[PDB]
Each structure stands twice: as structure tokens, then as C-alpha cells.
């Protein structure tokens, strides 16, 4: 256990335990290897959103609706639009959202996010775009959906450090490392990388 | 270890600051001034850039580095900062003067536990950044969180590199807090409702 995982455990040990129905989602995700947001990364996400106070959020990668539900609980007035291409997890997301009674505010698209731009554009623009899907298609998601961002909006990307594997010589992850370089050298966006959980990138339109 | 490797990776990605800012970073390294770590400062500024605060309170100026960085990020913002060491206060005032930010950044001299009433004149504050003596963190929070705006944010550096404060802060009834493991550790606190 290195210093990174020790600190993560220390932070997790300080967290207030979530409600029972939220813990059930975390338990299910562990059981079925659903890569939901790490506990520590989720807390940082929510606190940034709580500062941002967004009215509309776009999420790419619903899985079982965990992050969408957490975000919704944090922001009672906010509406959330989320995409998922897997049929089973889409099914689970819709049932979970229904069970929490957040189906009035959380809206799930079914299908690949690279083919749903026009349907998502109907309810653009979005104050926050949260990218948390296939790592190889990160640059495509950003390019496709950052026109729908509000003027003072923020794009947040999970899994940009990838368990610290991007930081070392990884060749013998190149796509993630490329995205990070591409994102940090973007002419329209200023970006900070937060080393929490699996790594968060927070991007914002330049002045 | 992995922690320092990730930090180096993030530092390697950073766009280089202006020359006068780099001189502050160089001076701080030369003279063991514990300014905000490069990676931690970027996270701070990006959160502030989202917050877009009009008034910031800072406890622990040192040589004016974090105050200057915050000021450059937020052209409209006014910053009020405290420093009890005479030499660092001297350096802060000269640095701020050299950057020509002395119209917007205002430095108090003295212990922050004895300057509450002078700070209260220009209350309230959208952001309170605590970055001073680690032993007096609970006293700073108690003293200065009444001057926080309704939708304000309290940010504490040096929470990982104290254990009592972290427990105290995480179990505060009026505030919700997340810990960011970057640099020396950041805590971001905010009113629950
Ligand atoms: N191109 C694509 N279009 C839409 N869905 C995607 C995508 N590629 C991956 N996915 C989905 O995105 C999910 C990533 S995991 C999502 C985790 C979730 N945000 C949480 O924290 O709770 C997977 O379930 C996968 O099915
Ligand atoms: N109780 C107190 N009142 C005011 N100043 C304090 C304090 N205890 C510590 N200090 C000052 O706070 C500084 C901590 S270093 C501050 C670093 C600065 N925020 C930056 O990132 O650039 C020290 O220079 C110390 O002199
Ligand atoms: Mg993820
Ligand atoms: Mg510090």
C-alpha cells in the first residue's frame, strides 16, 4: 500500500456514511464490478457542483445511475441528463432513478453518446458536462459536447490519472495521456488536474 | 512513490507562469517559504474561478504569492490577507506593489487571532483561505467563519501534511467538507444549506 492509497483510505474513513439506499447502490456496484465514482472522488465532485450550483447537468456514462442520483440529491433544483449505451445498466439506471423518485429531474438517454448529439442538443445548453465513459473516446466526447456548454460552464472528466498509470512509463493509457496533453494545451479552456480517486480534470472557458 | 510521481506528472503538464511569478517561486524555494504547491495552487484557482468571489480573506500571506496568483486569476476581486512575521509581511507588501496589485490586495500585519475587528470592517468574505499555523486552525475557523458570506467557501491548506481538526471539521453541523489530496492537502468547506 503506497501513500496514495493510504491517503484515500484516510479520507474514506473520515466520510459520513451515506443513506441506506445509496449504500445499496455502492454494494451492488462492488458485487457486479460496476466502475462507479470512487467515494473520495465523488465527494470532491459534489462539493465543486455545490459551489457551481448548476441548473442543467450532462453526464456521459450513467452506469446504474449512482453518480446521477448523488448529484441530484446534492442539488434539489438541478436537472440531469445522462447517457448509457449498455442495455442492462440503462435498465438498472432507470429503475434506480425511479426507486429514488428522481425520475422527474434525471433523464436517461439510451445509446452511444457519439450518435446521440442531436437529441442531447434539444435540452442544451448545460452548466456542467461530466465525462465518465470509455477512456479511448474522451477526446471525441469533449469535441462533440463542448459546444453545448454554457458560457460560464465547467467540464469534468473522471479517470484522467488512471490509478497513477499515466504518470509512469506506460508503453510496455497513451490515449488518456494524449487527452491530458490535448486538454491542457486547449486554446479555449483552462484545466486543473485533481489527484483524487481515479483522477479528476476540471475544465473551464478562458477569459 | 506514486504520490510524488503523480504530482510531477501534473507539474510537467502545467503552463509556465509569467516571469515575475516564477521569481516568487524561486525566492520561496531559496528561503524555505512554504508557499502553495504548484499543483495545489492550480486546484485552488480553478475552484475560485468557478466561485468567482468578490472578496477573499486569506490567513497566512507569507510573501504574497497565493494572494497575487488569486488576484491575477480574478481581476475584479479584492483580497484581504494577514501575516504576523515582519519580514514576510515586508516582502508581501513589496511584491504586491511590484505587481501593481496594491489597489486590490490589502495586507494586515499581526497575529490573525488579534486582528478580527479590523478584518470585520470589510466583512463579509466570499472565500476564506486558511494557510497558517496548523495548531491554530480550529481557532481561525471559529474566529472568522462568522464573516463568511451565506454561500461562501472556507478553504484550508495543510490538512494532510491536524488530525483533530480534520475530525472536527468533517463533523461540523453547519458545514459540509470534502478533502482534496493534492499538495499538502486541501479541505473545501461550505454551508450545508
Ligand atoms: N460511447 C459511449 N456512449 C454511452 N455510454 C458509454 C460510452 N462508453 C461507455 N459507456 C458507458 O459508460 C459507463 C462508464 S461507468 C459510469 C460510472 C458512473 N458515472 C458512476 O460513477 O456511477 C459504462 O456503464 C458504459 O456502459
Ligand atoms: N496566527 C497567525 N497569524 C497570522 N499569520 C500567521 C499565523 N501563523 C502563521 N502565520 C503566517 O502564515 C504563513 C504560512 S505560509 C503561507 C503561504 C501562502 N498562503 C502562499 O501559499 O503563498 C507564514 O509566513 C506565517 O508567518
Ligand atoms: Mg470513472
Ligand atoms: Mg500551506
Swiss-Prot record, chain A:
Q: Which reaction does it catalyse?
A: 5-hydroxyuridine(34) in tRNA + S-adenosyl-L-methionine = 5-methoxyuridine(34) in tRNA + S-adenosyl-L-homocysteine + H(+)
Q: Where is the signal peptide?
A: none
EC number(s) per UniProt?
A: 2.1.1.-
User: Mind listing the UniProt keywords for this protein, alphabetically?
Assistant: Magnesium, Metal-binding, Methyltransferase, S-adenosyl-L-methionine, Transferase, tRNA processing
GO: which molecular function terms? Answer: magnesium ion binding; O-methyltransferase activity; tRNA (uridine) methyltransferase activity
| UniProt-annotated binding residues for Mg(2+) | 132, 158-159
Residues bound to S-adenosyl-L-methionine: 37, 67, 84, 112-113, 132
Which EC class is this protein assigned?
transferase
Q: How is loss of this gene reflected in the phenotype of the organism? A: Deletion mutant does not contain mo5U.
Q: How does it assemble?
A: Homodimer.
The text of the family note is: Belongs to the class I-like SAM-binding methyltransferase superfamily. Cation-dependent O-methyltransferase family.
Additional free-text comment from the UniProt record:
Binds magnesium, but the ion is dispensable for mo5U forming activity.
Report what the protein is called: tRNA 5-hydroxyuridine methyltransferase
Species of the source: Bacillus subtilis (strain 168)
Q: What is the name of the gene encoding this protein?
A: trmR
UniProtKB/Swiss-Prot annotation, chain B:
- Molecular function as annotated in GO: magnesium ion binding; O-methyltransferase activity; tRNA (uridine) methyltransferase activity
Keyword Transferase in the entry? The reply is yes
Supply the source organism for this entry.
Answer: Bacillus subtilis (strain 168)
**Domain of life of the native organism:** Bacteria
Q: Name one GO biological process term.
A: tRNA methylation
Reactions catalysed, as given in the entry: 5-hydroxyuridine(34) in tRNA + S-adenosyl-L-methionine = 5-methoxyuridine(34) in tRNA + S-adenosyl-L-homocysteine + H(+)
Q: What name goes with this protein?
A: tRNA 5-hydroxyuridine methyltransferase
Q: Additional info?
A: Binds magnesium, but the ion is dispensable for mo5U forming activity.
UniProt key word Methyltransferase: yes
Knockout mutant characteristics: Deletion mutant does not contain mo5U.
E.C. number(s) listed in UniProt? 2.1.1.-
In terms of InterPro entries, this protein maps to: Cation-dep_OMT, SAM-dependent_MTases_sf, SAM_O-MeTrfase, TrmR_methyltr
